[PDB]
Design a protein around this ligand. Structure first.
Ligand SMILES: *[C@@H]1O[C@H](CO)[C@@H](O[C@@H]2O[C@H](CO)[C@@H](O[C@@H]3O[C@H](CO[C@H]4O[C@H](CO)[C@@H](O)[C@H](O)[C@@H]4O)[C@@H](O)[C@H](O[C@H]4O[C@H](CO)[C@@H](O)[C@H](O)[C@@H]4O[C@H]4O[C@H](CO)[C@@H](O)[C@H](O)[C@@H]4O[C@H]4O[C@H](CO)[C@@H](O)[C@H](O)[C@@H]4O)[C@@H]3O)[C@H](O)[C@H]2NC(C)=O)[C@H](O)[C@H]1NC(C)=O
Ligand SMILES: *[C@@H]1O[C@H](CO)[C@@H](O[C@@H]2O[C@H](CO)[C@@H](O[C@@H]3O[C@H](CO[C@H]4O[C@H](CO)[C@@H](O)[C@H](O)[C@@H]4O)[C@@H](O)[C@H](O[C@H]4O[C@H](CO)[C@@H](O)[C@H](O)[C@@H]4O[C@H]4O[C@H](CO)[C@@H](O)[C@H](O)[C@@H]4O[C@H]4O[C@H](CO)[C@@H](O)[C@H](O)[C@@H]4O)[C@@H]3O)[C@H](O)[C@H]2NC(C)=O)[C@H](O)[C@H]1NC(C)=O
Ligand SMILES: *[C@@H]1O[C@H](CO)[C@@H](O[C@@H]2O[C@H](CO)[C@@H](O[C@@H]3O[C@H](CO[C@H]4O[C@H](CO)[C@@H](O)[C@H](O)[C@@H]4O)[C@@H](O)[C@H](O[C@H]4O[C@H](CO)[C@@H](O)[C@H](O)[C@@H]4O[C@H]4O[C@H](CO)[C@@H](O)[C@H](O)[C@@H]4O[C@H]4O[C@H](CO)[C@@H](O)[C@H](O)[C@@H]4O)[C@@H]3O)[C@H](O)[C@H]2NC(C)=O)[C@H](O)[C@H]1NC(C)=O
Ligand SMILES: *[C@@H]1O[C@H](CO)[C@@H](O[C@@H]2O[C@H](CO)[C@@H](O[C@@H]3O[C@H](CO[C@H]4O[C@H](CO)[C@@H](O)[C@H](O)[C@@H]4O)[C@@H](O)[C@H](O[C@H]4O[C@H](CO)[C@@H](O)[C@H](O)[C@@H]4O[C@H]4O[C@H](CO)[C@@H](O)[C@H](O)[C@@H]4O[C@H]4O[C@H](CO)[C@@H](O)[C@H](O)[C@@H]4O)[C@@H]3O)[C@H](O)[C@H]2NC(C)=O)[C@H](O)[C@H]1NC(C)=O
Ligand SMILES: *[C@@H]1O[C@H](CO)[C@@H](O[C@@H]2O[C@H](CO)[C@@H](O)[C@H](O)[C@H]2NC(C)=O)[C@H](O)[C@H]1NC(C)=O
Ligand SMILES: *[C@@H]1O[C@H](CO)[C@@H](O[C@@H]2O[C@H](CO)[C@@H](O)[C@H](O)[C@H]2NC(C)=O)[C@H](O)[C@H]1NC(C)=O
Ligand SMILES: CCC(CC)O[C@@H]1C=C(C(=O)O)C[C@H](N)[C@H]1NC(C)=O
Ligand SMILES: CCC(CC)O[C@@H]1C=C(C(=O)O)C[C@H](N)[C@H]1NC(C)=O
Ligand SMILES: CCC(CC)O[C@@H]1C=C(C(=O)O)C[C@H](N)[C@H]1NC(C)=O
Ligand SMILES: CCC(CC)O[C@@H]1C=C(C(=O)O)C[C@H](N)[C@H]1NC(C)=O
Ligand SMILES: *[C@@H]1O[C@H](CO)[C@@H](O)[C@H](O)[C@H]1NC(C)=O
Ligand SMILES: [Ca+2]
Ligand SMILES: [Ca+2]
Ligand SMILES: [Ca+2]
Ligand SMILES: [Ca+2]
Ligand SMILES: [Ca+2]
Lengths: 388, 388, 388, 388
């Protein structure tokens, strides 16, 4: 109809209720489920769906052997109905590639897939299910993007890309698209020293992205975008409650404009909702691996370098595998506020469970409640022994 | 369009004709069918569909092992086309949880799923396929609901919940929702001493619920709701024709305001249509187990403590497994009256058939006819030996 | 929109072109295809689909054992997209039963399924996917119907039923339905001595049904219905070109008002287009079994007791299995005439191929062409050896 | 809405970006994927889909044995969602046959399937999913057509057919259809000596077809059609950059009106975009077999007998199997020009990989970009060893 505009502020997050779970690996043990990774969730005005990067094979299929690898010519961005598994028969391919992002602007959806060899990748921007624009690699080193939904405001949908080293300074760009066409792009500015896989959400005409400093920081970089001025800023979450993984143990004081040191060249896609006292951070429980997952209310986390948790909710037990996590919201729901939501990628298989030769995941997602709900843990649920 | 209003009275029930049957277990022996239980049927203005609680695995899948258990993080309310089986590819997830209810109000559908650990469950109310409201456990003991469709009148859709012990007094509440939001709630009142899994239907602006007194009664409690005054009453079916299971043998006189004694701490979801002489009761044939199923016309069953059958129809032979049963009607059919309908859950597997490690079911449903139709029996039809 | 009216006459049939073929048994050897029999084809104003009586199991499933049997509680009328196979995932159940008919009246579709034990069957008439009317058995001996589409004119859709013996005189009725409700019914009149499974089509406000005299005749009985006067007549095809199976060898003169003798208590559903010189008859090639299939132009077959073929087209080789055949037309196509069409049921399995324990079929259908097209043969194509 | 008119010219082709890839053989190793060949891509005003000739069996099914054969009664033209594989459950049958073409005219789609024995084949033209016209074989020797999409202009959709020998002069015809009816047909004229499987596209009210001279030429014949005058011409691509396969090595000067000699009685369906300097030719890399695939910019290839490449892009490595290739464009995209697109059939199985008894393929397709994008290679990706 008309372009959606980020006119509301976030609803108060007093707890998280279960939104969707596909139990993909469990079901896929005996049905035609595609092997995936890098999942996310994204809504259209009339439907919300699960998204992911398929590996172009079923989990039980012999081609599942080797799916720990990230970039092949057999991958594609696919979407399928909420809480269903990604099956060969219900999955819709949005585009071909090994890194992607996608968002609805109110009138139609923009999907971006990047493919190619390491030194010659290219992104192709699809709008209304048609290819519209193409961007060639600018640093010739794995052009890559969000791995979660982008956000739009009055037709403008910014997207963060990175090209170059994942363990050194790199060339990150913020592209402002409208109807799949480039209105403008900027180089990253601010104090964030390295950006990877931004998780974004919008409220009151401002887009907030919590990303991954794969180089030096265990605290997360944050990119705030103004989609009207088409300008942005960058810093890190000030809080000592560190949210990347692997990471050092929490200090008593964090860093606002520098990576918090202790772990180099590694990390995990993650997210947060930075909204004053209504601030919640997600993180794996383990400081060593993609294990467990929790949400912690850390009032003023973004700007208070001594902020510590005031409330919390466990999402996945430390005795269960987790993985990527990101933000999305249903900008087309009824009400006066935007209900914050997120998903956690529950990775199964390699490298942690090497008795099988594949790597895949299932998805669990929650949204906020103004009630103070009791908590449960949501593991993948599959028994690897069954796949042997 | 506009909210549906219960303006008609029931059609005269002279017999029952076959409405739907999915033969799920038979078909699922060699196809991707989800393991389920707690099924029901519910209509939208333009389509009627089967519903159930999936176990997040196929019947032939190795994860089918253990599905006798009720509450796990892998369950979800799913719906699928009438008479089809619940397959991995045609099932639509309505919400995540291990207890549910669902009903269309004329404009859109409300679905409710409850999940969580025993002492910290929470219900989330979805309306128009979006989460709208959340209710936390109030007695910290398996918050649970109908397991069959709710009914709406002018936007108001009451739903009965119970929280606390299943073998003692508990805290039952009647919630009146409108567009997924709570208008009001009451504590249970009347003479029913314990309520579990209410089966409901509406006619002439009154909602009638036949439930399960899991504590002491073998006669069924009944809750009549006024969705306009948003008030209700409760009693038991007076009739000596006892309809819970397990149960004592029928007496010559029943009880109107107390549980009929003889069997404690057990029962089965069941239903009835209480309409003066046009009164029909459903029950398992066996007084000992979920075996067989029949419909008996017991004129004035609700109010006549000596009412006995005047006509009957066998639905399932006592030599075949049955299970849950409940009411639903197509409030959007043509005509001057509401045609009463019901479904019977045909449970296969554990605990009665322990040669297999799973527990599932298929569905059979009938609706009333003003004709006096010949009868047939409708078993599940699967040969367990095939699954060995 | 508006009720369709049979306003056109038939197109000139100069040959038959291929319309649809699902290769169900071939494909089903390694995919989830339901076991069926008694198929047909029927169109809606915007789509034409395949129909059949499912056996409630896949062909490879263990429950396929025993599907030679006709009437069980696991059967249902299902429809699915033209030329696709009847799979567990794309088949739509129209109603539950072991005998059926179905037709679109222009506004919506009426489907009829009969179920029950031999002495207590009942038909339930569905209209707009809702049960509307029910008819109880009148002779208490396998109430049964067409097994192919009915035809409508200005809302009136006649359907022929038979109840009683299949090897003696029986009680056949012509029901005139409108919006699923009974407007009127008649007992069969005319000279046809026994009616079974009528194949019908309409043109210029007249409905012609070619049926099966299972009792004594090897020539086919014909029922012509006036859907406006709601009256009918009956006779046999006069032609010596006999079209039932099994049958005697063709004589030089046929019978117009009596069964042509030679074979008792057996037959096969078949059809014909009786239109003066534009008259074509279908029949199995073998006079002994459901083997092969051909179309023969026999000008004035209905009224000329010495009519013999003037042209022909082989549909299936005598070295391939055939079975049921019936008529249907797309009353909603463009043009000035109705293009005659038909399907042939290609039965595989029992009783002729008893190395397997199942019985199923695939479908092939042709429509007429005013061109004189070359011919090909269309067998089922599956290798039974593969199923062993 | 209204008939589409070829009002735009081609976009400038500076490179090719990835459009779709179904990874059919990979996925089909463990899921219900139909065996196919002769694929293509074609768009409707609101969706673009993959098309192919199914073999009426899954790849893993036992009936896959023997699918190297071209013409059987089990084949059919099927279409399915872009980038999905052709599965038993998502494939839509357009018509029955072993040679086909299909195109949308703006209002609806015309699909053509030819079937029959070698000496008695017939084409049936479907429009709006209904059979409308039929054409009988005129040379009684495998009537056959494009195997890729046709193109329409103001309702007129020309289609090229050939009937007669594939290794000698034959009878090629250009049919001009409108709403599935024949407006006119011509015999082939011009200097092309033999035509097979034309690949077509339209721009500025002109339709260009690049075909296959299976008889003598290794250069490709070209048929340019005027859909308004309903007239055409024919010649060969002048360029020495030979594009059929098998073929001699490139000379320094090509032939404009005669086949370039060196290889007889063989070839492969291929295509090109002939647009002055904006001219790109596709060809297998190997001159000996259907191996590898590349795109070469050969300015003025059609008219310059000494034209050689000025730029290029590899699509498939010479160490990977390729096959058929053809043109299609989304005539309903936004913008001022038509974005040229093409697909390459990646054949797996027989005859090159005879360890398996089947022959099938997967599809990869690209569209043009005005950017100068980096290149990647796109192989089928399946490991034959897995199928053993
Ligand atoms: C039914 O449901 C309800 C609703 O969920 C249940 O009630 C909830 O209970 C939750 C668990 O108790 C509770 O969550 C905790 O909240 C704490 C904050 O609340 C307390 O402090 C505030 C502030 O003073 C008070 O207002 C409040 O009244 C409380 O006293 C959090 O602080 C907790 O998080 C910390 O602990 C967990 C382990 O429990 C860690 O995993 C987590 O990371 C936090 O601790 C680490 O990080 C901090 C900060 O740097 C460090 O100080 C600390 O040492 C830990 O650091 C180590 O561990 C991390 C992670 O491994 C590592 O990185 C680091 O290097 C160190 O190794 C926790 O979130 C809910 O708030 C509460 N909800 C509500 C509404 O009440 C109820 O129990 C359920 N009922 C039943 C019967 O089960
Ligand atoms: C073709 O189709 C038609 C249509 O269906 C068939 O005709 C139907 O036939 C049915 C079976 O006969 C019949 O159903 C019965 O109706 C009885 C009522 O009718 C009779 O009584 C009335 C009232 O006086 C008369 O008007 C009428 O004319 C008849 O005479 C019911 O009473 C029957 O139910 C009881 O019996 C069945 C077993 O048949 C039990 O399973 C059932 O639970 C009922 O009996 C128990 O409960 C009562 C009440 O407390 C006790 O008194 C009794 O002792 C039993 O109690 C024990 O069993 C229960 C359950 O196990 C247990 O809990 C308890 O503790 C005790 O152990 C029955 O419903 C249809 O009405 C009739 N339909 C029509 C339209 O005619 C026709 O036969 C078919 N044709 C052919 C050829 O097959
Ligand atoms: C390319 O395609 C075209 C288009 O299809 C092919 O041309 C077609 O060729 C068909 C086969 O030849 C042909 O079909 C036949 O037509 C005959 C009628 O035509 C002839 O007679 C008329 C009338 O005089 C002449 O006008 C005309 O010019 C011809 O001379 C039919 O009569 C044929 O049917 C009979 O034969 C077949 C076997 O071929 C039987 O299976 C069939 O049942 C008919 O014969 C039985 O029944 C009759 C009637 O009672 C008996 O008299 C006879 O004895 C047989 O009875 C026995 O068999 C039956 C069945 O088993 C049994 O019940 C009974 O008891 C006895 O045992 C046949 O239909 C097409 O018309 C013709 N089409 C066109 C447009 O030309 C062309 O060949 C193809 N090209 C190539 C190169 O292959
Ligand atoms: C990142 O991505 C970019 C974008 O793709 C990459 O850059 C591209 O690099 C491509 C490969 O180098 C390049 O493709 C080539 O372009 C040549 C034309 O360019 C050159 O000549 C022009 C004209 O003078 C100059 O303007 C220009 O500046 C260049 O100097 C083509 O000519 C190439 O095609 C020929 O070679 C390939 C092998 O490379 C053959 O397979 C192909 O068939 C062509 O050669 C055969 O045919 C010709 C013509 O008859 C014969 O002369 C020749 O002998 C060969 O004939 C034999 O082989 C054929 C096929 O087997 C057989 O039939 C015959 O009988 C003989 O046996 C080639 O297309 C892109 O244009 C370039 N793109 C861009 C934008 O720059 C970049 O490298 C990537 N980065 C990294 C780091 O990898
Ligand atoms: C069910 O009852 C309510 C009345 O209580 C009907 O609501 C009225 O509908 C018309 C058109 O929607 C409005 O102009 C009235 O104000 C509506 N409501 C109220 C609450 O007064 C409703 O239309 C009835 N439903 C149906 C199907 O007829
Ligand atoms: C088929 O015939 C009936 C007439 O018998 C047509 O019905 C008339 O349609 C118009 C518009 O629907 C009404 O105003 C007339 O009163 C209708 N009916 C009768 C029964 O008189 C019907 O429209 C015809 N069908 C079609 C497709 O033209
Ligand atoms: C390539 C660098 C990038 C960010 C560190 O790495 C990612 C890390 C991954 C990971 O940490 O699991 C998985 C992603 N599939 C991969 N992205 C690509 C494009 O391969
Ligand atoms: C938990 C108490 C409740 C009512 C007695 O028990 C039910 C009995 C069941 C049963 O008797 O079969 C099955 C239901 N799955 C279960 N409900 C839940 C929420 O577990
Ligand atoms: C029952 C008599 C009727 C007509 C002769 O028989 C049919 C014959 C059949 C047959 O000849 O193959 C198959 C049908 N499934 C069957 N109909 C029913 C209802 O069982
Ligand atoms: C029959 C002649 C024709 C053109 C040379 O051959 C084709 C060649 C083929 C090929 O070279 O792979 C495959 C096509 N399936 C076939 N067409 C038909 C109708 O069989
Ligand atoms: C099928 O059923 C028969 C009869 O019940 C049984 O003897 C036979 O062995 C079964 N065959 C198979 C393959 O199950
Ligand atoms: Ca890091
Ligand atoms: Ca009880
Ligand atoms: Ca399988
Ligand atoms: Ca007979
Ligand atoms: Ca050639």
């Amino acid at each position: 109809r008309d372009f959606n505009n980020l006119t509301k502020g976030l609803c108060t997050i007093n707890s998280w209720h279960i939104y969707g779970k596909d139990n993909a690996v469990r079901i896929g043990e005996d049905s035609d489920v595609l092997v995936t990774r890098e999942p996310y969730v994204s809504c259209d005005p009339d439907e919300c769906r699960f998204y992911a990067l398929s590996q172009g094979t079923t989990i039980r299929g012999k081609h599942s052997n080797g799916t720990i690898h990230d970039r092949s010519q057999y991958r594609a961005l696919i979407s399928w109905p909420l809480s269903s598994p990604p099956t060969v028969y219900n999955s819709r391919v949005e585009c071909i590639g090994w890194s992607s992002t996608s968002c609805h602007d109110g009138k139609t959806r923009m999907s971006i897939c990047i493919s190619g060899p390491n030194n010659n990748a290219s992104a192709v921007i699809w709008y209304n299910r048609r290819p519209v624009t193409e961007i060639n690699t600018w640093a010739r080193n794995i052009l890559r993007t969000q791995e979660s939904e982008c956000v739009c405001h009055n037709g403008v949908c910014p997207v963060v890309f990175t090209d170059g080293s994942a363990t050194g300074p790199a060339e990150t760009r913020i592209y402002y698209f409208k109807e799949g066409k480039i209105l403008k792009w900027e180089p990253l500015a601010g104090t964030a020293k390295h950006i990877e896989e931004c998780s974004c959400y919008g409220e009151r005409a401002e887009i907030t992205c919590t990303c991954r400093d794969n180089w030096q920081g265990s605290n997360r970089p944050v990119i705030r975008i103004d989609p009207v001025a088409m300008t942005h800023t960058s810093q890190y979450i000030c809080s000592p409650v560190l949210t990347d993984n692997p990471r050092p143990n929490d200090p008593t004081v964090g860093k606002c404009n520098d990576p918090y040191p202790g772990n180099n060249n590694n990390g995990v896609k993650g997210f947060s909702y930075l909204d004053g006292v209504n601030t919640w951070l997600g993180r794996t429980i383990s400081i060593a691996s993609r294990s467990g997952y929790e949400m912690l209310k850390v009032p003023n986390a973004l700007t208070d370098d001594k902020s510590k948790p005031t409330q919390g909710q466990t999402i996945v037990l430390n005795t269960d595998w987790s993985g990527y996590s990101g933000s999305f919201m249903d900008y087309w729901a009824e009400g006066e506020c935007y209900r914050a939501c997120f998903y956690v990628e529950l990775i199964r298989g390699r490298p942690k469970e090497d008795k099988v030769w594949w790597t895949s995941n299932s998805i669990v997602s929650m949204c906020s409640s103004t009630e103070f709900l009791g908590q449960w843990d949501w593991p993948d649920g599959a028994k690897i022994e069954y796949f042997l």
